[PDB]
Write a protein that binds this ligand. Structure first.
Ligand SMILES: Cc1cc2nc3c(=O)[nH]c(=O)nc-3n(C[C@H](O)[C@H](O)[C@H](O)COP(=O)(O)OP(=O)(O)OC[C@H]3O[C@@H](n4cnc5c(N)ncnc54)[C@H](O)[C@@H]3O)c2cc1C
Ligand SMILES: Cc1cc2nc3c(=O)[nH]c(=O)nc-3n(C[C@H](O)[C@H](O)[C@H](O)COP(=O)(O)OP(=O)(O)OC[C@H]3O[C@@H](n4cnc5c(N)ncnc54)[C@H](O)[C@@H]3O)c2cc1C
Ligand SMILES: [Mg+2]
Ligand SMILES: [Mg+2]
Lengths: 526, 526
């Protein structure tokens, strides 16, 4: 005895969706809706790659719904008017949705609820995007979010464990009306009208291909689980990670987690059950350690709309930065003069995805390594091009890498160098040569230092530095010393080391974060 | 109206076994048998690792049979008497088996058939170990086996395609009698009585762990197929292989193929069906190119008992080798003085498995690179320690790498060097340091050349060359020139380049065989 409506904003899936399950029980009619308003799902500041991903996900969702005998409605316009129009037209009595924990989505929702309060329309919301409730974690640690990963783990180890996934829905006993001339009015838009077209030939035909949806997410999860099972049988339980693979398929699910095409609880429990089936029945929490950084960065933004800025944000230190547009433009385009940085930036601009080590390298190069430019300026590029540009996680990582004044392990000019780090992470040079073809014939000895090669080598390789490939934009030795002095001044000004701010816990945490050995080794420069 | 007996020698499996399926139709009783005679399945010249693998496979087979209500009989003694005893005791009327294509297993079988001819006992055999019949291939190319891989492919492309796998058996309508006190008389032996015990502490606790059986083979096949599916979706169809992974799990099925725990036809067809499901319905023969080298080397031994020797073998060239026992013992133990060679040899002696590049490197070092010692001497070690020491494939690979006088690409001292090749295949040095702990603290600069380091570096690293780690056993520059001169003399003596002998087809085949680029590159020494 209800006419229910489920609103799709995130969580574009049908598995493990309690809010959807609640809209089918005691329901005479059912409608599925998505509203295109220009701000939902990071559409305001976006580019071609992630638009393709979003459209593919929506098409997959509609195709999945067509099996049970239903369609997905897409409407263009403000939510506060679209909802009212649909209520007055269809005759809706109940609206169900999933919660958006970020503070920038709150005033949107508060407007709808009030409306439903003045028309006798029930409202239902359920949190299925995170493992723990941010408010409970904040209350357990006084009234402020934890500022350390170890403290966050300690706090969450007392609240309990996540809940198991829910079953799948059933549409057999519910009517799902569909209007005539549906594809002409409630159909899905196209990139041709929205104004997003490829900016270069590399976007049209990238080296690595991505597909959005839910079936691909489930297949990737199955492949991940069986790879781990085979590794466990071989004898590899949580081994040290030192050699990243940059020339093969990524096999990543972060873009799917961002949009909600895969459940976090399902992944969490599948990992542990897979481990227990093979080995004994002892609990090992190190398996799901990566999934806890995501929650640690999500819960930190609770109650702070200025979490993406340096001014007015109480959990960030104030640091005097510089502003030069030429350097920033060179960094964004990929004309810095260091092949390791340029390759990663061009990969981001073409495909929209990058490995962790590259992101750390480019962030350190921009902020506290050589140039001394604010992280707010570089965060915009990641918001614009990344496939998984979460509003809170990216800003949290930027503030973690930079602005940590009292951590001296991140200020070393030898370990975090745009030459030695690239040599370590790409001994062969195939990744560098793939995205910088100008240095295809350059010997591996001078591949990362093209300006130290003689003229005969340049002529033979067909790359004269200064005409075919730009000269370096800065001297690392000189820039590093002045940046170190400037940060030492910041430390002197901020006397107390125990201030409340986002920072790493210890040095080993940094070394593991950056894929480097903990103890001293014979291959450690300074 | 029969009492059938299936004899297990190879093909220790229940899936895709036509001979087994034939012993169940029209049968009143059924017996499964394995005879331990001291020569079956490479038991005469064997060590602890492969014995463990064989025993695990037999235990898995017995456990699988116990589900349907049957056991596996194991008897110790000569086959020609055991078969007769069992025929006179049980009352057998039909014997079924699988064919062993190698010529060393023929006189064993010819004795049994004759017996069955004088007692009214039917005999049935079926070839399920190979994809093509060696006799048909030999007849299609005159009366001799093809001596080139391209010629073998050309010949086999006209015979047709392999047959699809057969169904699984059923034991419901067949009686499977079991005797009392079974575990006391027909039980499985143990390594404790056979005389195989670990020779060192590294055998007891190896770094990589192996398990024999059929379930593991099927799981490995599933993992392989889904990895390939994901790679195809990403956009990687038959890419160039240049970076081997030596610090992770092997994920190999060659030992299972050797003993017959996995079918070759099933793998062949699963690969192609997996490819067709994702991509279009066009045939691509490059997918199963590795499975054809195995058949090429198997069919070459047809009609030649001396295929494992240099004297009396018509498909091998006669070359004057040297004989020094000290050098051979150093090569076998792993005291050569070159860490790249020692690590691979110690890995073989501990675990029993090695990557292709290491096998090629050590074979070239022994035979035609530096020492000039016969391949027959080194083949014995591989027969003794390898988990997949096939009688014909290993000898064929040895004769392919060595004795190819007219192929000058394999005679280059720069590309196939025990220093540069190791640097190329192990840029980090983790694999080398895992099996040569004496050089754990040695800098990566001198890791592959410990004798060129100063004394202070040796003292700091705690490795004085000559006392803690042996000095090099030979000078590569001098050895290479004399070996080249000696092989040039062989070429001068053997005038005709078109002699009938096992040899590579072209230079690109060698370069791909050894995981090296085809065209010239800036990182090519000579
Ligand atoms: C400057 C910078 C910005 C980043 N921005 C993002 C972002 O917007 N979104 C994002 O998901 N990751 C972000 N990361 C973390 C990291 O770059 C990605 O999580 C990485 O690409 C995951 O790849 P993977 O799935 O193969 O790793 P895996 O370890 O195989 O994936 C496990 C999962 O754990 C989570 N995870 C792992 N590391 C982190 C981390 N440091 N912070 C948060 N979650 C993590 C992700 O959901 C990931 O899918 C950023 C890192 C840096 C240095
Ligand atoms: C001196 C020497 C001796 C060798 N002895 C053997 C041996 O006794 N048994 C053996 O199976 N391989 C042998 N090989 C080939 C090679 O070393 C192994 O096939 C390799 O370990 C296969 O690993 P993989 O399964 O990961 O390779 P994959 O390519 O992933 O395996 C595909 C399959 O193709 C077959 N195959 C691949 N290459 C060859 C080859 N060159 N010759 C024959 N079959 C091949 C194997 O059955 C293998 O399982 C030898 C090579 C050399 C240089
Ligand atoms: Mg992932
Ligand atoms: Mg294999």
């Amino acid at each position: 005895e209800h006419v229910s409506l489920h609103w799709f904003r995130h969580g574009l899936r049908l598995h493990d969706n309690p809010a959807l399950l609640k809209s089918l029980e005691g329901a005479k009619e059912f409608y599925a809706l998505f509203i295109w308003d220009g701000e939902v799902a990071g559409t305001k500041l976006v580019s071609y790659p992630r638009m393709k991903f979003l459209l593919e996900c929506l098409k997959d969702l509609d195709d999945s719904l067509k099996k049970h005998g239903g369609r997905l409605y897409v409407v263009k316009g403000p939510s506060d008017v679209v909802i009212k129009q649909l209520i007055e037209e269809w005759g809706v009595t109940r609206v169900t949705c999933e919660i958006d924990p970020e503070p920038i989505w709150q005033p949107r929702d508060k407007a709808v609820k009030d409306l439903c309060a003045t028309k006798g329309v029930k409202w239902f919301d359920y949190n299925s995007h995170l493992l723990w409730d941010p408010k409970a974690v904040c209350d357990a640690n006084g009234g402020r979010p934890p500022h350390t990963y170890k403290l966050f783990c300690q706090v969450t180890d007392l609240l309990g464990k996540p809940e198991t996934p829910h079953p799948d829905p059933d549409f057999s006993h519910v009517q799902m009306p569909v209007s005539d001339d549906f594809d002409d009015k409630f159909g899905l838009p196209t990139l041709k009208e929205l104004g997003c077209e490829p900016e270069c030939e590399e976007q049209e035909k990238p080296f690595n291909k991505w597909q959005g949806g839910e079936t691909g997410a489930l297949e990737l999860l199955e492949t991940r689980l069986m790879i781990e099972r085979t590794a466990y049988k071989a004898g590899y339980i949580m081994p040290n990670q030192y050699i990243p693979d940059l020339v093969g398929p990524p096999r990543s699910m972060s873009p799917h987690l961002r949009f909600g095409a895969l459940s976090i609880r399902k992944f969490y429990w599948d990992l542990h059950n897979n481990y227990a089936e093979v080995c004994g029945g002892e609990w090992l929490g190190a398996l799901t350690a990566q999934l806890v950084w995501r929650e640690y960065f999500y819960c930190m933004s609770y109650g702070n709309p200025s979490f993406d800025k340096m001014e007015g944000n109480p959990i960030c230190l104030q640091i005097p930065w510089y502003k030069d547009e030429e350097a920033l433009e060179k960094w964004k385009q990929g004309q810095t003069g260091f092949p390791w940085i340029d390759a990663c930036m061009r990969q981001l601009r073409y495909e929209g995805w990058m490995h962790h080590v590259g992101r750390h390298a480019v962030a350190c190069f921009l902020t506290r390594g050589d140039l001394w430019i604010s992280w707010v300026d570089g965060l915009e590029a990641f918001y614009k091009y990344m496939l998984d540009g979460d509003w809170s996680v990216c800003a949290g990582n930027w503030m973690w890498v930079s602005s940590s004044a009292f951590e001296n392990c991140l200020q070393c000019p030898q370990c975090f160098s745009p030459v030695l780090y690239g040599m370590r992470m790409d001994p062969t040079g195939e990744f560098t040569r793939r995205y910088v073809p100008q240095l295809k014939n350059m010997p591996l000895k001078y591949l990362f230092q093209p300006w130290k090669a003689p003229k005969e080598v340049q002529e033979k390789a067909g790359c004269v530095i200064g005409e075919d490939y730009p000269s370096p934009m800065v001297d690392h030795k000189e820039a590093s010393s002045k940046c170190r002095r400037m940060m030492e001044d910041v430390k002197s000004i901020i006397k107390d080391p125990e201030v409340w701010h986002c920072t790493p816990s210890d040095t080993n945490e940094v070394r593991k974060f950056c894929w480097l050995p903990e103890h001293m080794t014979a291959d450690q420069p300074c």
